[PDB]
Design a protein around this ligand. Sequence first.
Ligand SMILES: [Cl-]
Ligand SMILES: [Mg+2]
Length: 250
Amino acid sequence: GMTRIASHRGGTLEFGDSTPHGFTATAAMALEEVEFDLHPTADGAIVVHHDPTLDATTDMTGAIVDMTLAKVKTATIRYGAGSHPMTLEELCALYVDSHVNFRCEIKPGVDGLPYEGFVALVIAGLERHSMLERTTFSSFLLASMDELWKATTRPRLWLVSPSVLQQLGPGAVIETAIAHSIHEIGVHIDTADAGLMAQVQAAGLDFGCWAAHTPSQITKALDLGVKVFTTDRPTLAIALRTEHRMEASV
Ligand SMILES: [Cl-]
Ligand SMILES: [Mg+2]
């Protein structure tokens, strides 16, 4: 069975967080998906950024949803050689001719609540640039998973945080996914193991991982044979997978 590779935020630890360079470089790599997160601006635009605020990865401060796109566009991304935050449209333009597809994460705002009407905006923006049919959607929020279920027939996956996994426990995580018509979960690589994967697959659910940024984590993901993992080191992940595939044929 194959293990797919998704470039986390365009490959954070190689090119900076959600930068034009990372997304451009990722579009040309022999991997299967690019992962990214989206937030609305005050004036109805869609920008590609991890946090709901600009503080951590740029020179500016503030919540994206309280700002116009023009203000967001004045920010400079740390380690991004002067680049600015991207819009969804600009991201779509990079992938028009690439074989790499989208893994789109729906994030809440600063208050931890889903952005009202945003799933509809995102689906419309993707449709406008003919990328919907190449998109898988992900979220940590079940409210957002429920919205996606009603809004799109595209594949969805529920991101299950270490806290949720530990506190609900795997049985209840699986219960919950089934009750919500979710067919795939993604767990932090450091919380994955053979028993968890087996339990999840025995329930009919697909099983993948995230936060696989080091060689040991990447190799664990490949050894486990998980569906997909996100990584901040896509170049390394590709290399390790190629090597893994060799060793497996021998
Ligand atoms: Cl593979
Ligand atoms: Mg994400």
